């Protein structure tokens, strides 16, 4: 049951936009809402509006009086001397709650005229006509206007609606909540050479009487929220999908072949999401818009998605096809379960984020294989256990503070830190995988189909929300639908992993009792760390003995420590028979390293990742080597690679080398075995016999049979030896001699890989392989032996580093004339120059990176150069570079770059709270408090980034470096 | 390619990793584009 927090119900909204002026960056328009009051004596009506100048408001064609105030413009007063962050977080939460449409509130308060009170008490319709104007928007609509001359379509100027969550208040007045569903009528009067893309279906396109402008009329009969309404106006090249004909793809001019190749896969994503769920795609059209200077890499609205143009690749670009493919896939998953089925509160957001991430993981499983699915699930689980042990924990479904261990309030999406938002979505889809583990996948897809079917029977009624609230899901409704389809309720699993905000830590060690033939496990939990919680459920453990692989369920109550499980025979060591594996197959194992008295070959605690856990198991090194070689699970091979770094014995070198030589191993395991072999080789110097590690293996796999030092000409058509070939010198460059310097046998090998590179014969580009070659050249740089702080000049350069510097100079200059796909070699060469500057080789001068961080460059070059400037101002304690970065945060045209500068200055801070630094003035505290209070008031993501930066630099209490 | 890059760095605006370093390791100076996605994303040999 859904009861509105608003005293009115909104039925229909007309959004008309005229006069989109690109020179002056200005729009004019009106908005006409059709509300039905649910309570009599409505009097004031409270709507949401930011940055719009409200000209006039007429209610039922009668002139009404409005008052506007935004408390989130300046959160705390300018003349308050408070400088602690808990004060700002409480004031910011109160300010966002005072404009919240999820309460009754709002920023624009319109007073109902007196003569309509007899129209409002007996509950009859009210039609509110606001007309507004955005004079030069700092948020919401982003105007990308290039400085080439010509007409606005000839130079490539466009507008798009940017922002996250409820940010539609930034470009027209609305009820900007996900729970106020209404039908829509959208008119946009644009230039005759431009096209206006929006939500709904385009009913017509009429000309103006001078035929210089045309009006696009859109209609949206599926009741969506105001937060799902978008806009993209530009000189877009239109491409109808040749497979599905209601799907149109819009790109920027001159990028039509890239659009043709890139969006050619999307019909398979549509077919997948419509056959695992049994509902068809709910909207009547689908539109993909590719734009410049995007807010996020992929945004999903109702019947529309806005991607950045940096996803567009051609047919000869690999290492970008899977990333763009999965961006399209998660946009479509959010089309199904973020835009059609919406949110009932700010709680129950974990339901939608979990269903979107879970069905996108099912797509990844079918498309890229079960092994890529397991690797992705393991990397997401490692991400969340790192974040939750780092700071507190992520609390899905809080109850309204519920989480007081962290420096922001979790009551609203616009007060969350961006890393918390990312980990929120990550934990939501892993908890949905856990619900699939308890209640099987076919019942899970039946739950999702029941939600979609209730929403689509709801979506066709005309009753104003008598039935339109069946399109809003809640937690209680989701659990009730689960209990309807399965008969089991998941309330212990919901109580543990949703309502409780923690992950578990397992420390395991075994001992084999030879007398009674049992395996005595010893599993203890660390439940006193700040991020942890105590697990009391069951726990699966998989033991591989000589007779095969056996699963055991252990009951781990609070007082439990020793778990005795039984062991089988050892009669497959009496005769040589094959040892049967986890799957149905069996292999020949070399049992010379195994103990004579124990049959068990390896043990895995929680193999299926059925809890949110971090396992620290103490096996013997031969058990880790057997688990690396003969396991049929990629997460166990990865964890054995990760645990073999502590055992540098030559049997582990043989194990990793046999993994590296082995095709029919998953390629991301061999790419990890490269770096593990490099670390082991560095640890057993003065024992290593022959050549450096992986060199003979590289010449055996990727070089000519007649010439060992000449590499084969590039043929990248295998896509697994391409990735292994481009990752093996990067790990090989981490080799070090007894003198702690990279050997001149590996550096010469990398330089010969660079010289003899011929790419005139493959059908794929070479930009990522050459960029990884520059990364391998950067890995070999050891710190220089400066004497008496000698100035680093050209004559006293290292003889090794002069070759590296010549190569990166040649590569960067050749990129200036023949550019790569996304300037990958510019990014790699800037990263390598920063590596050479971090050691004492090149003079520590930020002027090159400051010239590459200007506005007109590509955004990857910009963020690489700004990363180099952030690293410089951390190491050299530069005041003027920090003022340069803070000025670039305040006034840069691209808001993604501002968010990225705040992000990089949070990750690599110039000082922490423990450090005494020269950059701990009252002036810097006043600048960052002014940046939290004012200055970042237009983005909701810059303000949370400024809160994160103030927390990283000065902590939760009063800045110490202050009177 | 070395001859081409030295010729293009000598007859234009130049940068340098070292102080006043034009003879050895000359860098072609970074110029901003008005539309950078066109020179980034588009293929040149097709």
């Amino acid at each position: 049951g859904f009861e509105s927090p608003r005293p009115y119900k909104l039925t229909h909204q007309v959004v008309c936009i005229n006069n989109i002026n690109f020179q002056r960056k200005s729009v004019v328009g009106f908005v006409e809402l059709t509300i039905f009051p649910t309570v009599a004596n409505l009097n004031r009506i409270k709507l949401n509006s930011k940055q719009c100048r409200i000209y006039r408001v007429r209610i039922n064609d009668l002139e009404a009086a409005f008052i506007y105030n935004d408390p989130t413009l300046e959160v705390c007063h300018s003349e308050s001397k408070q400088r602690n962050l808990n004060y700002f977080s409480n004031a910011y939460a109160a300010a966002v709650s005072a404009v919240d449409p999820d309460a009754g509130n709002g920023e624009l308060c319109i007073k109902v005229p007196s003569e309509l009170w007899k129209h409002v008490d007996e509950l009859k319709v009210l039609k509110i006509h606001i007309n507004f104007s955005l004079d030069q928007p700092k948020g919401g609509l982003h105007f990308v206007v290039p400085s080439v001359e010509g007409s606005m379509a000839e130079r490539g100027a466009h507008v798009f609606s940017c922002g996250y969550q409820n940010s539609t208040r930034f470009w027209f007045p609305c009820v900007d909540s996900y729970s106020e569903l209404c039908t829509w009528k959208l008119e946009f009067t644009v230039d005759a050479a431009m096209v206006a893309v929006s939500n709904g279906d385009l009913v017509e396109t009429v000309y103006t009487h001078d035929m210089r402008k045309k009006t696009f009329h859109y209609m949206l009969t599926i009741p969506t929220a105001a937060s799902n309404i978008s806009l993209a106006i530009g000189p877009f090249e239109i491409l109808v999908d040749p497979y599905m004909h209601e799907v149109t793809h819009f790109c920027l001019p001159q990028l039509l072949p890239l659009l043709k190749h890139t969006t050619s896969y999307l019909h398979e994503v549509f077919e997948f999401y419509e056959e695992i769920l049994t509902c068809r795609y709910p909207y009547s059209c689908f539109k993909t818009v590719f734009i410049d200077e995007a807010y996020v890499e992929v945004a999903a609205y109702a019947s529309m998605s806005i991607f950045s143009t940096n996803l567009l690749h051609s047919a000869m670009i690999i290492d970008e096809t899977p990333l763009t493919r999965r961006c399209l896939a998660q946009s479509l998953a959010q089309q199904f379960f973020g835009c059609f089925i919406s949110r009932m509160s700010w709680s129950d957001e974990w339901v939608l984020k979990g269903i979107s991430g879970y069905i996108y993981g099912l797509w990844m499983k079918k498309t890229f294989g079960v092994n890529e699915y397991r690797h992705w699930i393991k990397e997401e689980l490692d991400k969340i256990v790192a974040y939750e042990l780092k700071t507190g924990g992520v609390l899905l479904h809080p109850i309204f503070n519920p989480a007081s261990h962290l420096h922001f309030s979790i009551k609203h999406p616009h007060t969350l830190s961006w890393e918390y938002y990312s980990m929120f979505q990550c934990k939501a889809h892993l908890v949905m995988r856990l619900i699939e583990n308890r209640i099987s996948m076919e019942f899970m897809l039946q739950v999702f189909n029941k939600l979609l079917s209730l929403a689509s029977t709801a979506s066709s009624q005309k009753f104003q929300s008598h039935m339109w609230s069946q399109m809003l899901v809640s937690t209680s409704g989701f659990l009730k639908s689960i209990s309807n389809v399965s008969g089991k309720d998941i309330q212990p699993l919901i109580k543990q992993w949703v309502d409780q905000s923690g992950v578990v830590k397992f420390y395991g060690s075994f001992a084999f009792n030879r007398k009674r033939n049992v395996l005595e496990l010893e599993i203890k939990q660390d439940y006193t760390s700040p991020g942890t919680q105590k697990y009391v459920g069951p726990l699966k453990v998989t033991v591989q003995e000589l007779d095969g692989s056996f699963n055991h369920t252990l009951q781990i109550e609070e007082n439990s420590l020793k778990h005795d499980i039984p062991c089988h025979s050892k009669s497959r060591r009496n005769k040589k028979k094959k040892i049967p594996l986890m799957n149905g197959e069996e292999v020949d194992m070399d049992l010379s390293a195994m103990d004579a008295d124990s049959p068990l070959l390896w043990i895995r605690i929680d193999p299926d990742m059925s809890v949110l856990r971090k396992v620290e198991f103490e096996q013997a090194d031969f058990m880790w080597q057997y688990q690396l070689r003969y396991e049929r699970d990629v997460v166990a091979q990865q964890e054995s690679i990760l645990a073999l770094e502590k055992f540098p014995t030559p049997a582990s070198r043989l194990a990793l080398t046999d993994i590296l030589e082995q095709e029919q191993c998953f390629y991301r395991v061999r790419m990890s075995a490269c770096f593990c072999l490099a670390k082991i080789a560095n640890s057993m110097v003065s024992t290593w016999t022959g050549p450096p590690a992986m060199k003979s293996l590289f010449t055996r796999m990727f070089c000519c049979k007649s010439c060992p030092n000449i590499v084969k000409t590039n043929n990248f058509m295998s896509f697994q030896s391409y990735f292994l070939q481009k990752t093996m010198p990067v790990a090989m460059a981490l080799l070090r001699d007894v003198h702690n310097l990279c050997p001149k046998e590996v550096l010469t090998f990398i330089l010969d890989l660079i010289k003899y590179n011929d790419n005139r014969k493959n059908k794929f580009s070479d930009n990522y392989y050459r960029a990884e070659m520059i990364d391998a050249l950067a890995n070999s740089v050891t710190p220089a032996v400066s004497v008496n702080n000698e100035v680093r000049t050209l004559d006293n350069l290292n003889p090794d580093v002069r070759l590296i510097l010549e190569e990166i100079t040649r590569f960067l200059n050749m990129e200036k004339l023949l550019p790569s796909y996304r300037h990958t070699i510019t990014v790699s060469c800037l990263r390598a120059i920063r590596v050479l500057q971090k050691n004492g080789h090149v003079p520590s001068d930020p002027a090159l990176f400051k010239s590459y961080a200007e506005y007109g460059h590509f955004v990857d070059i910009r963020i690489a150069a700004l990363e180099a400037v952030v690293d410089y101002t951390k190491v050299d304690r530069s005041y003027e570079e920090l003022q340069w970065l803070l000025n670039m945060i305040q006034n840069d045209p691209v808001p993604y770059v501002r968010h990225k500068i705040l992000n990089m200055l949070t990750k690599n801070p110039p000082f922490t709270k423990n450090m005494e630094s020269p950059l701990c003035n009252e002036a810097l505290v006043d600048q960052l408090w002014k940046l939290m209070n004012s200055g970042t008031s237009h983005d909701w993501r810059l303000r949370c980034g400024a809160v994160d930066l103030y927390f990283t630099l000065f902590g939760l209490s009063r800045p110490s470096c202050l009177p | 390619e070395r001859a081409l890059t030295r010729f293009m760095a000598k007859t234009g605006e130049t940068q340098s990793l070292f102080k006043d370093d034009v003879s050895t390791f000359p860098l072609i100076a970074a110029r901003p584009f008005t539309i950078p996605y066109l020179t980034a994303l588009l293929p040149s040999e097709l």
Binding site: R760, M814, L817, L818 | E1, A3, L4, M8
Partner: peptide
């Protein structure tokens, strides 16, 4: 027989 793009650009400049 046909100059590579590097030396084609060098010839042009």
């Amino acid at each position: 027989h046909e100059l590579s793009v590097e030396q084609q650009l060098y010839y042009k400049e």
